[PDB]
């Protein structure tokens, strides 16, 4: 019955003592942290506490969106040699770092994801030609569905794939997706593999990546400029922001201390130096 | 009144009993006792395999040695029990399964010996690899050493053999082999075998995963990390040694999807 | 006017949206419906209906009526499989084109139990016993009666009751499986073997065929709607 925004217990008055009750002395080897308050070691006063842990609840700690990726698409001229650029991006929280580490304070989590889509666009060729406001379609291609090969193939028809139609110059695009995990919670660390290499099988036939599984395959996001070829090329970037609302977490882990190196837990040489210099006898 | 103490303990699982006189109580991970899979939480339809005493008893691994230059030691579960009597057999023949464990590490010395050992149970102890060229590159064989387990190192060594890479872990001790300061390791259920006080560490771990049951052959749910927090010294000698031993016992052992024998390539 | 504020998402078009909109033809006298027999409520009930599996998909037999036929013979007993099949209902060629699978192709996750029914279409004078086997994944895919016999299996007697059903129970690590061919979400192996052998008298066709059907059980479900890849438009 203790809510997140409720006041923490008041610190009460305590005078002098001298007996056989031992608050100060314990043993950490047992694995238990001594749950002491100030009155156990010092003489304190009656104090009506007012502060609350309202701002540190799991909900509140993650109550923010974070740039997860930056996608790049364009609309060049018809006379072009290289094909119009369409972006494909696999849905992961692990391309960026900030959000990842927060998520990584825990081993498992349940949340409904809210995604926002900020879109930028610019001219690239130093000309004086013109472009007409663009519309961008962000289709969600789940694992299994056909992933576009052309900016103009049959996939972009979207009969069952969720797709967003964003007009440039308006409110950034935002959708919601429920807990879509194949497991009962999203796993942030997997201590295993996908395949089991068997004795009577070729090593090649039995290999898989360490810590890699379907637990994390959510398909890709495909985007293009709906507009047809324009005489003067226009570049555009869609910045995606993920907010894990309605969140639940399990098993606390120490936070990443060394800069990340790939989607795994691996680290590289010369990055393994997080702490600076500080002498033992100085403040 | 009767002299009952938290240092003196005896635990019994099956036809095996552990006894000690220098304990520091006992830890039950996250306050949860191991349990059987509930109907409300179940998923595979087939009637499950509950081996009981058959698999659920204490199992002693191969003893290792603690000296001044040891950097640490590690093991994974179930992995570290893969070849232990019935449990292992029951593991190799069923597609899925779940289990808890009571891990008991042993290491006594003298009132003249000193040192502290951090015994940490890390759910999903995904260790770091040895290559700076390719990530998540450690092979199954090297990942799962089984009962012998593995060790931590004090210096990162990137494999530069691009022809036939080593494909193993290179777990740096201070980063608890995962890229996170060992100092925070205490966030995980743990105990400290500080020679002065205690000779053992006992931790009870329930089954922990993102799902009710999983393929124990493909996935390790808990890791066992033991690192000397304080160094091992005795009197005034230069190279002292004290053995460390781990006995592990599954708890509430159950398995489903019985089929033919799994013969994995371990080497 | 009432002070209002535009929040993100305004003006966008999500195809998965569900809102009201102005009508193009107000007061249109809609024609009332009539009881047309055979209405369907959900996609899964189509899934529960048994459809025939195009088993043998060899270069010669594929895309021909013959792909539905699995030839059996009165050859002396052998421990070799009659047919091997992977539990990837939505991704393995042989299962991929059955209604069940085709349906599965519209979703991303699949869960629940499945049933395999086999139909002996040889002569009445023909007798025999077989072992249909389902082995959960993780071990050596069965290839001899022996290992298959260790898994889930029905031993079928050929007689007056023409068909036999083997139920592949839902045994999975995950709550839901992937419509794609994947290791983590692997389903297992389906296999048929001769228990005895096919026996016929004289003046009786020595070789015959068998038909196979697969469907979902009352507790089969799918989720995450996606577009199929078994259909496409070129240009």
């Amino acid at each position, epitope marked *: 019955a203790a809510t997140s925004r409720d006041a923490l217990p008041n610190t009460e008055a305590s005078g002098p003592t001298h007996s056989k009750e031992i608050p100060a002395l314990t043993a950490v080897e047992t694995g238990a942290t001594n749950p002491l308050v100030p009155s156990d070691t010092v003489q304190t006063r009656h104090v009506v506490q007012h502060r609350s842990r309202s701002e540190s609840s799991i909900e509140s700690f993650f109550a923010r969106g974070a740039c997860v990726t930056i996608m790049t698409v364009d609309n060049p001229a018809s006379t072009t040699n290289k094909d119009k650029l369409f972006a494909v991006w696999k849905i992961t929280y692990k391309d960026t770092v900030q959000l990842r580490r927060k998520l990584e304070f825990f081993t498992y989590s349940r949340f409904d994801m809210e995604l926002t889509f900020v879109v930028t666009a610019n001219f690239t060729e130093t000309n004086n030609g013109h472009a007409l406001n663009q519309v961008y379609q962000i289709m969600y291609v789940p694992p299994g569905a056909p992933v576009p090969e052309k900016w103009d193939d049959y996939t972009w028809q979207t009969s069952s794939n969720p797709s967003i139609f964003y007009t440039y110059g308006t409110a950034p695009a935002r959708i919601s997706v429920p807990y879509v995990g194949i497991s009962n919670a999203y796993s942030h660390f997997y201590d295993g593999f996908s395949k089991v290499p068997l004795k009577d099988q070729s090593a090649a036939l039995g290999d898989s990546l360490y810590g890699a599984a379907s637990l994390n395959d959510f398909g890709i996001l495909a985007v293009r400029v709906v507009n047809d070829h324009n005489p003067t090329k226009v570049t555009s970037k869609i910045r995606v922001y993920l907010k894990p609302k309605h969140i639940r977490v399990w098993c606390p882990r120490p936070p990443r201390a060394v800069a990340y190196y790939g989607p795994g837990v691996d680290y590289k040489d010369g990055t393994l130096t997080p702490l600076s210099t500080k002498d033992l006898t100085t403040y | 009144a009767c002299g009952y103490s938290d240092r003196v303990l005896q635990l019994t699982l099956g036809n095996s009993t552990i006894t000690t006189q220098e304990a520091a109580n006992s830890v039950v991970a996250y306050g949860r006792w191991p349990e059987y899979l509930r109907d409300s939480e179940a998923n595979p339809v087939d009637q499950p395999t509950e081996p009981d005493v058959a698999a659920c008893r204490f199992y002693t691994l191969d003893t290792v040695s603690w000296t001044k230059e040891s950097r640490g030691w590690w093991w994974k579960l179930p992995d570290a029990l893969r070849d232990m009597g019935l449990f292992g057999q029951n593991m190799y023949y069923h597609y899925l399964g779940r289990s808890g464990y009571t891990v008991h590490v042993q290491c006594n010395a003298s009132k003249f010996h000193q040192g502290a050992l951090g015994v940490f149970a890390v759910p999903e102890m995904c260790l770091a690899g040895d290559s700076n060229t390719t*990530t998540m590159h450690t092979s199954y064989q090297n990942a799962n050493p089984g009962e012998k387990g593995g060790t931590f190192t004090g210096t990162f060594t990137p494999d530069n053999n691009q022809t036939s890479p080593a494909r193993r872990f290179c777990p740096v001790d201070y980063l608890l082999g995962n890229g996170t300061l060992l100092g925070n390791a205490f966030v995980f259920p743990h105990q400290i075998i500080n020679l002065r006080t205690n000779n053992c560490a006992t931790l009870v771990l329930p089954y922990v995963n993102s799902l009710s049951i999983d393929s124990m052959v493909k996935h390790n749910n808990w890791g066992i990390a033991i690192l000397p927090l304080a160094p091992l010294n005795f009197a005034s000698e230069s190279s002292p040694e004290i053995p460390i031993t781990l006995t592990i016992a599954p708890m509430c052992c159950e398995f489903n999807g019985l089929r033919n024998i799994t013969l994995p390539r371990l080497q | 006017g009432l002070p209002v504020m535009n929040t993100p998402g305004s003006n966008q078009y999500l195809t998965a949206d569900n809102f009201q909109s102005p009508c193009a033809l107000p007061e249109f006298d809609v024609t009332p419906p009539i009881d047309i027999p055979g209405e369907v409520k959900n996609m899964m009930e189509l899934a529960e209906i048994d459809t025939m599996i195009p088993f043998d998909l060899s270069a010669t037999k594929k895309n021909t009526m013959e792909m539905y036929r699995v030839r059996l013979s009165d050859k002396p007993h052998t421990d070799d499989p009659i047919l091997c099949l992977s539990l990837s209902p939505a991704s393995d060629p042989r299962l991929s084109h059955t209604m069940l699978g085709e349906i599965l192709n519209y979703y991303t996750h699949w869960a629940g139990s499945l049933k395999f029914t086999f139909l002996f279409c040889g002569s009445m004078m023909a007798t025999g016993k077989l072992l249909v086997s389902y082995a959960p994944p993780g071990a050596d895919p069965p290839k001899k009666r022996k290992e298959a016999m260790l898994g889930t299996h029905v031993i079928w007697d050929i007689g007056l009751q023409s068909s036999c059903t083997m139920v592949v129970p839902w045994i999975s690590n995950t709550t839901y499986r992937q419509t*794609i061919d994947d290791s983590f979400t692997e389903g297992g192996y389906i296999s048929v073997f001769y228990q005895t052998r096919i026996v016929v008298p004289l003046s009786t066709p020595r070789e015959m065929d068998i038909l196979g059907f697969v469907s979902a059980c009352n507790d089969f479900s799918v989720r995450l709607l996606r577009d199929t890849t078994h259909i496409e438009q070129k240009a």
Partner: nanobody, 128 residues
Framework: QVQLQESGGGSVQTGGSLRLSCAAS????????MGWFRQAPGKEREGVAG????????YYADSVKGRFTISQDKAKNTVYLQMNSLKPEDTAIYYC?????????????????????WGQGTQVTVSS
């Protein structure tokens, strides 16, 4: 699966050009870097070439760089492999390799580990 169907078994002499192609028409989580593996009956199976599905992440085995190149048709869907200046040391059975979820060939970059759909096999002999 995807479709993987390969051909191109021409026993050319030492120093000739050969082209290998593997179909990848159907679009599953499509062959990322793709993959080409050769099995020398003296040795075993080994990885060789590979260009990312969309991106220009093409990895080359130490033994084949420059001479062997990977490229494909982002439409006609088939994967080409230009193998020029052929040594007699490259006489092996080649195979194409679908590595699905692109990250499979981004993490490890090279194939081998994230590869689920296996090719048929074409015999290439480069002799005197």
């Amino acid at each position: 699966q995807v479709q993987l169907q390969e051909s191109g078994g021409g026993s050319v002499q030492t120093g000739g050009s050969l082209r290998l192609s593997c179909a990848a028409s159907e679009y599953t989580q499509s062959s990322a870097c793709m993959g080409w593996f050769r099995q020398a009956p003296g040795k075993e199976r080994e990885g060789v070439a590979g260009i990312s599905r969309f991106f220009g992440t093409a990895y080359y085995a130490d033994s084949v760089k420059g001479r062997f190149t990977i490229s494909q048709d982002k439409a006609k869907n088939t994967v080409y492999l230009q193998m020029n200046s052929l040594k007699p040391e490259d006489t092996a059975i080649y195979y194409c390799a679908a590595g699905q979820g692109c990250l499979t060939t981004i993490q490890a970059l090279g194939g081998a580990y994230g590869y689920n759909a296996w090719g048929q096999g074409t015999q290439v002999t480069v002799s005197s």
